[model samples]
Target: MSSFLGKWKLSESHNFDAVMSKLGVSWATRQIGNTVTPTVTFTMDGDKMTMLTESTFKNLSVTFKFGEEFDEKTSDGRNVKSVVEKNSESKLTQTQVDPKNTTVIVREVDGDTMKTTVTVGDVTAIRNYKRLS
Candidate 1:
């Protein structure tokens, strides 16, 4: 989990707007969502882990345990439930499921980079961030 801690500056994103369209996000919303770069931060306290996302589009945070289901408001404005797990010291997986759809996210953190893959069925988006001191 140490490898996953700290802040990261959003560097690049690919297919993000396409993934948003797959999720039923409006083209108008995608315009802003695709335009903003986000800052992501991770922190651990006792048995809980929290991830914070900041951007001009929206600011959000989630706190969860390794295998527990938590409630989240999706970027597309859906109320969903998510479970996150540690795949390895440098890897994590998160799955969000709700009445209408499901999304899969894989995260990898290393010395100076954090990379993520967002998948909704066959469509996928990849984003990378630079670790900040």
Candidate 2:
């Protein structure tokens, strides 16, 4: 559970543009978004775990309990409920639900690499991050 703590740098991504398009993201957002590398940082404070995705375009932060749900204002500027929890069938992978469009994110850390899979509708986007600390 703690293996994902600390900072990480984007290594590479697969099908990112496809996923961004599915999100109805703005043209400028996706165009400029693809040009920058984002760093993700995970930190624990008491019972809360925080994940912060930092980039030149946007810095997104989420802080929540392992099983608790919180209201979120997305990077796209919409309010939604999000819960970050451990996957019941997997030890290494964690999942979050956006529910807006049945969007799901699967995140896992193995060795020095962190993997992120984002699914919306039937489209899937993948990302990799290398440990920075």
Candidate 3:
């Protein structure tokens, strides 16, 4: 199994503006781009991993425990939570507990690139993140 553990720099990212557009973000593209979303870091242990996402969004902190099953929590005022069971090596089935919860799907690998997607109602946002040292 590939362990996603390391300091990952966001070399390139797309779809943020698209999602924000769908959500009708108050800020314009230029304004949004000016905001800061911190780098994401991952740490792995056996089949469990933790991901840290710091950002100016003020709604992006999260932690997940992955194995045969997984549990997730977001560090926001809403206190959202989720439990996901492994469906395959690269897939998970999740159950969320939060009124504002929106299902998000993401895929990451260490060599060259990373991808993420967010699906809410009919809006789907896709993003690509390149690796940088």
Instruction: State the C-alpha lDDT per candidate.
Output: 0.73, 0.66, 0.47
Query: Candidate 3's residue-wise lDDT over 1-133, tens digit each?
Result: 2434554545444555555445344443323323553355555545566555554543243556643333333332234455545444444334444454556554545345554455556655554445545
- lDDT string for model 2 (9-46, tens) is 77776777777777677665575445676676777866
Between candidates 1 and 2, the lDDT winner: 1
On the 0 to 100 scale, the lDDT of residue 82 in model 3 is 58
Tell how far residue 125 is off in model 1, in angstroms: 1.2
Task: Give candidate 1's TM-score.
Answer: 0.83
Reference-based TM-score, model 2: 0.78
Model 3, global lDDT: 0.47
lDDT of candidate model 1 versus the reference: 0.73
Model 1: per-residue Cα lDDT over 1-133, one tens digit each: 5567887777777887787677677555576556777776787866688778676555778788889877756555766777788888778887766664657788886467787888888877786889777
Candidate 3 residue 96 Cα shift, in angstroms, is 6.8
Q: lDDT (0-100) at residue 16 of candidate 2?
A: 70
RMSD, each candidate, Å?
A: 2.2, 2.9, 4.9
Rank list by lDDT: 1, 2, 3
